[PDB]
């Protein structure tokens, strides 16, 4: 199981799709088993102090990879946020994969962004989907909003067909200021799940190209911060790999980052979607 030449990969996809996606099912089942013989601790996520900081009780942040907040005077657990570094193709810790912030963790969320020198946010969910609460709004509708010692100012917005780009300037009262740009994918079906990959490919390319040398990791979140988040991470990384080596290793890369945050790429449908995105990128020449 190693890099497939980019020229065979598209044929590989035909094979994975055939006989009612039997191949895809094998692969993804292998993904879900890939940690069967691994005990990976998440003690901090489970500590009684940090429970209210987890959006879902079963979606945790592995200890070894968890992003740490600088501790606060005089609580012991003021260092916890449900978030993990994840590798990209290029560098280690190219991403912070995290849950959609809760109101109760908005300060942590922006503090992490400051401390980690993050300059790009990728949001892959709407606040509400199909009448359900997915994410609380951690940014100002207009002008400024204060979260702890970080003051966030919305500078501009461009609303595209399928996603929105908001440019913020944030300030640490401790002032020192930084630009943070948020790429927010907004197109989510009332019924069923996303199907066409091309708009997503474009969203990935543009949000990825926005990364600045040399800055902190890109923050990527959806609701739980695992399924759609992992899908973005694999598509982005594999495009890097294709550009660099003209090979692809979806199954191997995904098994790897699965050790860094639980459940990255959560469904077979997302797993298939990854391939469609990459197929679109390869066929588009
Ligand atoms: C149990 O977990 C889940 C179950 C279902 C869903 S779901 O909402 O029903 N199903 C999905 O999300 C699917 S299906 C094919 C594609 C997708 S998401 C496609 C997509 C869209 C925009 C971007 Cl930027 C990217 Cl990178 C990828 C999402 C999750 C999740 O946790 O992310």
Question: What would your notes on this structure say?
Answer:
By secondary structure, the protein is α+β, with helices and mostly antiparallel strands. The protein has a single domain (1-285), classed as Protein-Tyrosine Phosphatase, Chain A (Alpha-Beta Complex), CATH 3.90.190.10. It has helices at residues 6-33, 43-46, 106-115, 198-209, 227-245, 250-257, 268-283, and strands at residues 4-5, 66-68, 80-86, 95-98, 120-123, 128-129, 132-133, 144-147, 150-159, 163-172, 176-185, 218-221, 247-248. The strands form 3 sheets. Strands 2-3-4-12-5-11-10-9-8 form a 9-stranded mixed β-sheet, sandwiched between helices. The protein has a two-stranded antiparallel ribbon with strand order 1-13. The chain is globular. Bound molecules: ligand NX4. The ligand COc1ccc(S(=O)(=O)NC(=O)c2sccc2SCc2ccc(Cl)c(Cl)c2)cc1C(=O)O binds at residues 124, 185, 193-194, 200, 203, 222, 224, 226-228, 231-232, 235, 266-267, 269-270, 273. The PDB classes it as hydrolase/hydrolase inhibitor.
Topology, element by element:
Blueprint lengths: L3 E2 H28 L9 H4 L19 E3 L11 E7 L8 E4 L7 H10 L4 E4 L4 E2 L2 E2 L10 E4 L2 E10 L3 E10 L3 E10 L12 H12 L8 E4 L5 H19 L1 E2 L1 H8 L10 H16 L2
Parallel strand pairs: 4-12, 5-11, 5-12
Antiparallel strand pairs: 1-13, 2-3, 3-4, 6-7, 8-9, 9-10, 10-11
Helix pairs in contact: 1-7, 5-6, 5-7
Bound molecules: ligand NX4.
